[PDB]
């Protein structure tokens, strides 16, 4: 029983809560796609003034 308590305690210290990680994963993948889109938007700034010449 003591060995089981020590092993369960190690699990309490280090184990991930995977149900929480699934939500973090979905939101981070959306955030990464939005960041790529935002970088594409920022990349376009130089071409705006080409029309002035």
């Amino acid at each position: 029983k003591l060995q089981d308590s020590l092993d369960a305690g190690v699990g309490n210290l280090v184990d991930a809560d995977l149900a929480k990680e699934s939500a973090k994963l979905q939101s981070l993948q959306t955030k990464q796609q939005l960041g790529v889109q935002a970088l594409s938007i920022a990349n376009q700034s130089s071409s705006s003034i080409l029309s002035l010449f």
Binding site: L2, S5, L6, G9
Partner: protein
Amino acid sequence: NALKSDFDSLRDQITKAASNAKFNGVSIADGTTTKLSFLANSDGSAFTVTAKTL
């Protein structure tokens, strides 16, 4: 006499059981402390557990 001998052996086993009731060096039942205090909130206020000596 046989009953008395069995009784004394079981009595010594109680001492062994109580002394081994430790989780990573701390015990709530071995008599070595009056209480353990665990964190209750982020300010460090305690969650007291009174020791119960076995």
